[PDB]
């Protein structure tokens, strides 16, 4: 029953059925009175899920080639920060098997075969596991809530079978999800200010914290 | 097209499509046959 940063306008719709329902809504964004296209109580918890899971793949992924290079498990050519890895070819470009403009077309082809399927399950649940898709359309049916399908592919260890266990574990997903969005936003501002990768930013601060903070470094 | 072609058949659109074709034709006559003051035929 922990409640922080809440208002009586915010608790009119945040009744606690959400996983990360801590009452934090000062602006009043999940109000069902003016629910529209993207500012509505059906898309916004599901938007935090997809932004949470891409940031948990993002915050872990932008530091993993830098941590693994200091301990000596990957080559130093790939042991590079995230910004000088072909993402922003101004601050640095690394030569992959393809140039990143061709890799972007390969990205949105595979994202277009993955996020269009994720899109139409939100508008109508279970309507995608009917048409033939490579003999694997039966597993891609999903639940009523489109943030958690829980099929044979997205729950392939079956972890969280109990309803009380799965609901409490959904709280740990969004709280690790929300920390990862502030990490990637923290990764973004440190890449512009410090100009060096985030694992070097942790190692610089762990040696001299009073001389390598945000105030000293730009 | 029971109503899209009805909008396309309205007076300003059909004046734009005809005079676009009409001025399009008279410009292209004035390219291959320019400075035409006397009809030779």
């Amino acid at each position: 029953r922990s409640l922080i940063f809440a208002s009586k306008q915010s608790l009119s719709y945040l009744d606690g059925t959400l996983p990360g329902d801590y009452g934090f809504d000062p602006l009043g964004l999940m109000d069902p009175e003016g629910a529209g296209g993207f500012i509505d109580p059906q898309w916004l918890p599901y938007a935090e899920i997809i932004n949470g899971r891409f940031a948990m793949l993002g915050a872990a992924g932008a530091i993993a080639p830098e941590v693994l290079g200091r301990i000596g498990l990957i080559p130093q050519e790939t042991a590079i920060p995230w910004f000088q890895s072909g993402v922003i070819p101004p601050v640095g470009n690394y030569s992959y098997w393809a140039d990143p403009y061709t890799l972007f077309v390969l990205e949105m082809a595979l994202m277009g075969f993955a996020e269009h399927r994720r899109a139409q399950d939100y508008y109508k649940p279970g309507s995608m596991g009917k048409q033939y898709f490579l003999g694997l359309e039966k597993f891609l049916g999903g639940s009523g809530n489109p943030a958690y399908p829980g099929g044979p592919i997205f729950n392939f260890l079956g972890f969280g079978k109990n309803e009380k266990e799965l609901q409490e574990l959904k709280v740990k997903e969004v709280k690790n999800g929300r920390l990862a969005m502030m990490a990637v936003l923290g990764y973004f501002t440190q890449a512009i200010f410090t100009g060096v990768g985030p694992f070097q930013n942790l190692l610089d601060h762990l040696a001299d914290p009073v001389h390598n903070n945000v105030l000293t470094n730009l | 097209m029971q109503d899209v072609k009805t909008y396309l058949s309205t007076a300003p659109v059909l004046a734009t499509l005809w005079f676009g074709f009409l001025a399009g034709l008279l410009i292209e006559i004035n390219r291959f046959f320019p400075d035409a003051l006397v009809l030779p035929l």
Binding site: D99, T102, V105, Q120, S127 | M1
Partner: protein, 203 residues
């Protein structure tokens, strides 16, 4: 029913009765039933001209690269000199297609009227559907006139889907000649060497 967008509801005007119907109408231009029959007739001759187009673009240029034939590229094929001038090659073709497509114009408007040969009235086309004329001049093997309708619909679906790949291909050959200034078989072999880099973003 296979559909182009499996979550979407199929349109009312695309009921699946047409060959190659996958419900793809986001702009809804085939909503009128009178204009839908014109557009199906427009798509049939578009499909067959592009498959005839793709056999004159990608087949002889593959034989040009393999050394089987010494034909020029498809972009510069009209620039070549022949026994008839290319300005007056058009009006021979326009006259010959005023009888080919003008008599096809009557079949779309009035079905079952131009199926009889005017010079010899005993000769006639064995066709009952608009866009599929039949007869000896167009179906000499008789594969398009079958008693069963499920096999006949799938064979017409096989004709449409083979067509619309070529309409992507001939349009693909046009933009490749405008961008790369290279024959599309040579664009394929450049892409077959290094597909990571030799793309549209190779500039």
């Amino acid at each position: 029913r296979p559909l182009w967008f499996p979550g979407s509801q199929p349109p009312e005007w695309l009921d699946g009765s047409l060959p190659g119907d996958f419900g793809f109408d986001p702009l809804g231009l085939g909503s009128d039933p009178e204009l839908l029959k014109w557009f199906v007739q427009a798509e049939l001759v578009h499909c067959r001209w592009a498959m005839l187009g793709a056999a004159g673009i990608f087949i002889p240029e593959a034989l040009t690269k393999a050394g089987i034939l010494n034909t020029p590229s498809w972009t510069v094929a009209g620039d070549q000199q022949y026994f008839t001038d290319a300005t007056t090659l058009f009006v021979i073709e326009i006259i010959l297609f005023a009888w080919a497509e003008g008599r096809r114009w009557a079949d779309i408007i009035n079905p079952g009227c131009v199926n009889v040969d005017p010079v010899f009235p005993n000769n006639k086309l064995t066709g009952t559907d608009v866009g599929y004329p039949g007869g000896l001049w167009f179906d000499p093997l008789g594969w398009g006139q079958t008693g069963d309708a499920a096999k006949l619909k799938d064979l017409r679906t096989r004709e449409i889907k083979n067509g619309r790949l070529a309409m992507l291909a001939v349009l693909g050959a046009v933009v490749q000649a405008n961008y790369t200034h290279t024959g599309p078989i040579d664009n394929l072999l450049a892409h077959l060497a290094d597909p990571g880099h030799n793309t549209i973003f190779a500039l």
